[PDB]
Ligand binder design. Sequence first.
Ligand SMILES: O=C(O)[C@@H]1C[C@H](O)CN1C(=O)c1cc(Cc2n[nH]c(=O)c3ccccc23)ccc1F
Length: 351
Amino acid sequence: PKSKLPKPVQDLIKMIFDVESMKKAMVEYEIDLQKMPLGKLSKRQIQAAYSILSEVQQAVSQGSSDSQILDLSNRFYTLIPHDFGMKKPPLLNNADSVQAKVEMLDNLLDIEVAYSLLRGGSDDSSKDPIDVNYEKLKTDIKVVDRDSEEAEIIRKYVKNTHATTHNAYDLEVIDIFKIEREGECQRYKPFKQLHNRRLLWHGSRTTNFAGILSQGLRIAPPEAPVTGYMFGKGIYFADMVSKSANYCHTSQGDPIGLILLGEVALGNMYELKHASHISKLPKGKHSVKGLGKTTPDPSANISLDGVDVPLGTGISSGVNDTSLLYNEYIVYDIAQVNLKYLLKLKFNFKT
Ligand SMILES: O=C(O)[C@@H]1C[C@H](O)CN1C(=O)c1cc(Cc2n[nH]c(=O)c3ccccc23)ccc1F
């Protein structure tokens, strides 16, 4: 059975549902596949790990000793078995180590969604599994003509917003997809006319895109420690392609990555220079903007389908004493995002 989908779409489907890629991500995080196989992942186990990780975070920040931290750290390694043989696991005694485990759980959530999609549903050998797996995304995916104005605008956005501090690689756009998740347009209606709507980047491991397409971008679950995210539990975006592209976690051994373009209803922005692990926005605020030292040239903004595209070259923002080299944007209501495009990127590493 041969699928009728365009070849770029078929290859995309194979990328996101690649089971061996899910295993490789788990191994990359040091998880013990024998004790925690991909098929044994569950959301409740992940949430329990989140909760334990919160206790470690509270102990770490409140200034505890390694003896007091030891029991809390060991508890986390019980819920998520790691591959350390018969040696004691590394102690989670500092905020950086705890942060790494927060990031691991974030990725396990999307992997569990992807595998759950593959192992659910029906099996029909008369259909092409590419077609079967495509239908599980509840997302309409179309290839954008390379000569369309959409493509030129998107390519210029990629070409102009690569940061100098991310010059270990440059980006080649292979395929541009126009994506429409079922029900997302309806969910976006209260914000579709809001001011300060921008087209922003969101990169992520390829293993997270089956979950992102079928369920959309989500906020971290209630069990996740809010102190594990620089601006709290929201959905994070960038206006520099390279800043988002770094979160694809590509390498010489895997140079193909995926990145999202989404219309984000920012509205009135809460502008911050340093970490603020907030639960809600102040009254009247719709989003947070981490103020970067560098910003795309404001005068170079253009309009695509009524949405501002900040594709200008990077220049100084005039903001002093900030923790961020480049901007980032956070919304705390999943309804404020309307995904528009998905790009397949080739990373040419210059190292
Ligand atoms: O993606 C997740 O793991 C988490 C959990 C849940 O999916 C929601 N989520 C985030 O949106 C999230 C992402 C980052 C990384 C990041 N920071 N800044 C950027 O500009 C940026 C641009 C593109 C891709 C990533 C980034 C940090 C904290 C977060 F909450």
